[PDB]
Design brief:
Oligomer: part of a larger assembly
Number of helices of chain B: 1
Radius of gyration of chain B: 20 Å
Structural class of chain B: alpha+beta
Number of helices of chain A: 1
Chains: A little secondary structure, B alpha+beta, D mainly beta
Protein name (chain A): Tail assembly protein 1
Protein name (chain D): Minor tail protein
Distance between the termini of chain B: 24 Å
Protein name (chain B): Distal tail protein
Organism (chain A): Chivirus chi
Number of strands of chain A: 0
Organism (chain D): Chivirus chi
Shape of chain A: elongated
Largest sheet of chain B: 2 strands, antiparallel
Largest interface: B-C, 16 and 14 residues
Order of helices and strands of chain A: H
Strand content of chain A: under 5%
Chain lengths: 39, 56, 56, 68
């Protein structure tokens, strides 16, 4: 919800965009965050 | 006549309903002085030289 | 207890606050004499009630 | 909200209750504090950006798909 507080500057929430890469592309399951390398 | 001004700085915030707030900004007021100088015959020269030298 | 004819005036004395920040004093002579001033007083009612914010 | 030195401790995320019953007719609402603009030695006042009440987690739906 901190996005909701971030949009506290709005003029009043629909969106349409592509993504800037994050850590989703999977090759090793992580039941907990051990972070990862980057190659 | 000689003119002197003792200046404070005191911000006052007044709400929509007239409720007021008070804040003196200067602990000790800053002081200023003024006077009309009328000089001539080597006194004008003294004033001019001294004031030009001082400046600020 | 006094008679009606025992008074000068019943002038108001409301809550007042000096208006201008810097005071102009006209010294027509040294401190021994004329030093008139032109204060301005703003009369109102002080309203804010201070219950200081708890757990500072 | 334009505020005098009444909320100088108030920090973003705090909670406070505002009331303007005789001009705007709003009934003593509780608000969450957001952005705050602390003032300088002049000008006195602090601007408080504030947002209606937020909430925590709780249970409404029973959405456990429970695949086969």
């Amino acid at each position: 919800m901190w996005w909701a507080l971030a949009m506290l500057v709005a003029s009043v929430e629909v969106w349409t965009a592509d993504w800037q890469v994050l850590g989703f592309g999977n090759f090793r399951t992580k039941a907990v965050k051990a972070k990862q390398a980057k190659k | 006549g000689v003119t002197e001004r003792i200046e404070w700085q005191t911000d006052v915030m007044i709400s929509e309903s007239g409720a007021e707030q008070r804040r003196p900004i200067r602990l000790h007021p800053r002081r200023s002085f003024e006077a009309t100088f009328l000089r001539w015959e080597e006194n004008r020269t003294l004033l001019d030289t001294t004031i030009a030298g001082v400046g600020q | 207890a006094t008679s009606r004819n025992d008074v000068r005036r019943i002038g108001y004395i409301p809550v007042a606050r000096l208006d201008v920040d810097g005071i102009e004093i006209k010294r027509l002579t040294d401190s021994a004499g004329v030093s008139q001033v032109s204060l301005t007083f703003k009369f109102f009612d002080d309203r804010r009630i201070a219950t200081p914010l708890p757990l500072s | 909200v334009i505020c005098d030195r009444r909320a100088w401790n108030v920090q973003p995320g705090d909670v406070l209750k505002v009331r303007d019953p005789k001009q705007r007719g709003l009934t003593e609402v509780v608000i969450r504090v957001g952005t705050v603009e602390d003032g300088t030695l002049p000008d006195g006042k602090i601007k408080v950006v504030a947002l209606q009440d937020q909430f925590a987690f709780q249970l409404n739906t029973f959405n456990q798909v429970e695949p086969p």
